[PDB]
């Protein structure tokens, strides 16, 4: 098994070192690859280190950006990434390479998330989405300007779960923005209450926003 370190929030121009404890085998026997995956996108080979000799080979695109080392005593490989930008925000995996027999990467770790932002911990603004100008009405909440991930959204404290769509957050200018809609019969809201519950554990914040009809 291969265990990697936890998630990471780093500023632009800074560096990160992430770790990968190798175990269940002899480290100096097998190479160690590293792989990059941006969210919702493909895999990308970075390079490998050979612990036995510390020997490196890099995808030319990552030469200089990534530096692999390995402390044989503690069975642990590292990858340092330097001069970080938005492009470096990704999940990174360490992966054990195969043996003489036929090479090929076999055992993956769980991954390590890296987020690049200049933002500090910031609580979300929560805005109700009531219809402006039918058998079903759609309502919603816009959760804007928070950091870091994640936030959770429910409706009526969980008891409204049908017709709910909570979208993946998108990071623009250092902060996250997410949305959630809920569709209920036009015979219910606004006579029945609909409230979004938005939790942001990193800022110790919970917000209930009752959705009320627009004024006029």
């Amino acid at each position: 098994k291969l265990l990697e370190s936890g998630p990471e929030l780093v500023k632009p121009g800074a560096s990160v070192k992430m770790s990968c404890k190798a175990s269940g085998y002899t480290f100096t026997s097998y190479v160690m690859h590293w792989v990059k995956q941006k969210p919702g996108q493909g895999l990308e080979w970075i390079g490998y280190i050979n612990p036995y000799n510390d020997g490196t080979k890099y995808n030319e695109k990552f030469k200089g950006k990534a530096t692999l080392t390995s402390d044989k005593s503690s069975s642990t490989a590292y990858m340092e990434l330097s001069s970080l930008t938005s492009e470096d925000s990704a999940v990174y995996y360490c992966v054990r390479g195969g043996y003489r027999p036929y090479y090929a990467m076999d055992y993956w770790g769980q991954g390590t998330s890296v987020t690049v932002s200049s933002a500090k911990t910031t609580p979300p603004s929560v805005y109700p989405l009531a219809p402006g100008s039918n058998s079903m009405v759609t309502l919603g909440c816009l959760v804007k300007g928070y950091f870091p991930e994640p936030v959770t959204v429910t409706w009526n404290s969980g008891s409204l779960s049908s017709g709910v769509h909570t979208f993946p957050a998108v990071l623009q200018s250092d902060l996250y923005t997410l949305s959630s809609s809920v569709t209920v019969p036009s015979s219910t809201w606004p006579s029945e209450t609909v409230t979004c519950n938005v939790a942001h554990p990193a800022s110790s914040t919970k917000v209930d926003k009752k959705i009320v009809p627009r004024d006029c």
Binding site: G98, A104, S125, G132, Q172, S179
Partner: protein, 213 residues
């Protein structure tokens, strides 16, 4: 230079059906090709190495063939767990290049989007900002286009889009689109619209509102 072309990028299929994913290598890579499976949320897992050899613990319905330049992964009689994303990778020497990846998705019947549009809340307005949100929900297939308009002209920028993965229950897709503006930009114009171009209609669905309402 080594380029790995994996197609299709998007594949629709039912349970029990027999699908085939291909990988073209730009040059002879012999049998040095592996196939991985990545479930939603997890690390990838090796299915096949050496183009045709199943890794230990991998079910036999999976089946790799091909050599040199042309490779395929087949999955006979699909199961619920078999749905996800699937990647090829060259593993001789450097670079150990991945193909772009294939998202194996559960087919269903075509459904038009349910489009709702939402003006900026009064709460956001007091902060000095304005976001107009458009939901386009429970559509199939996943391909769609959204265009914003302010008065009678397109707005390209300020638009952030987000998409759900395929639904647990009804196997559809949904999409949120938010247009963000200054309060002064928002207040300087009246009409705001959201056009949904989907295969389920030749004509785009248009939802709009007048600010003065």
């Amino acid at each position: 230079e080594l380029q790995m072309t994996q197609s299709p990028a998007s594949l629709s299929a039912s349970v029990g059906e027999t699908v085939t994913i291909t990988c073209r290598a730009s040059e002879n890579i012999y049998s040095y090709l592996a196939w991985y499976q990545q479930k939603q949320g997890k690390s990838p897992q090796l299915l096949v190495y050496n183009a045709k050899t199943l890794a230990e613990g991998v079910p036999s319905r999976f089946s790799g063939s091909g050599s040199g330049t042309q490779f395929s992964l087949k999955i006979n009689s699909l199961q619920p767990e078999d749905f996800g994303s699937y990647y090829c990778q060259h593993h001789y020497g450097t670079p150990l290049t991945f193909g772009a990846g294939t998202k194996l998705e559960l087919k269903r019947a075509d459904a038009a989007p349910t489009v709702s549009i939402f003006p900026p809340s009064s709460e956001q307005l007091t902060s000095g900002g304005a976001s107009v949100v458009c939901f386009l929900n429970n559509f199939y297939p996943k391909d769609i286009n959204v265009k914003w308009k302010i008065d009678g002209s397109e707005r390209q920028n300020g638009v952030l889009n987000s998409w759900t993965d395929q639904d647990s229950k009804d196997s559809t897709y949904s999409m949120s689109s938010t247009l963000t503006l200054t309060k002064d930009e928002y207040e300087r114009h009246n009409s705001y619209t959201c056009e949904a171009t989907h295969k389920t209609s030749t004509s785009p669905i248009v939802k709009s509102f007048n600010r003065n309402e």
